[PDB]
Amino acid sequence: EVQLQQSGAELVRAGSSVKMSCKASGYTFTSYGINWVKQRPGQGLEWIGYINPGNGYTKYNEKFKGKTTLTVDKSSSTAYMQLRSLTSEDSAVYFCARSVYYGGSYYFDYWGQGTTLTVSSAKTTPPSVYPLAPGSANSMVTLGCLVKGYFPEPVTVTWNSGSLSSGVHTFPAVLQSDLYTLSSSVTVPSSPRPSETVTCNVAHPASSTKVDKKIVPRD
């Protein structure tokens, strides 16, 4: 089975560079080319360039040349893509794909899971969990929890350690000031709160943090 395992997620300072991987298996590495595609949340896939393992021939997309360099290791069936002089715009998920010939021109038949690149000067830092209670001023009440200032992703949130599953919406994080911020909501009958305890549990593996925040009445 043709397969392409790409490198793990990367974290780098702007102005620096990075070299990601793409190990191929299940087929003749030199008999096929490897293309690199870029994907930023901002929809679309950009073709970065292409490399031929046999000769080492490289063809670049003018906008990615100068900063990008494609190479290969015809001994471990691994293709590398180096990105230099990084900036916020080089933050995305990069994929590698195999090209096949079919009547005239090529196409990509197999892709890798993708490699996530986050260009930032941030260091691992736990989030601050702020409890969201209605403002001091009927039947179903929504409560929230704001998880702000953490790095890097992911963060795991649950309510009452899982005993509160329904009516829960944990939103995607967003890159605040070089840091991530997310939120979560849970809707319980007015009989359960503040009559009982409602707690958001946010875990952040990278910082080895497990926070339990209680949502209490008033501001």
Binding site: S31, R98, V100, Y101, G103
Partner: peptide, 9 residues
């Protein structure tokens, strides 16, 4: 006049 497959870019 073409080929078609077991190839690459």
């Amino acid at each position: 006049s073409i080929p078609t497959h077991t190839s690459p870019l």
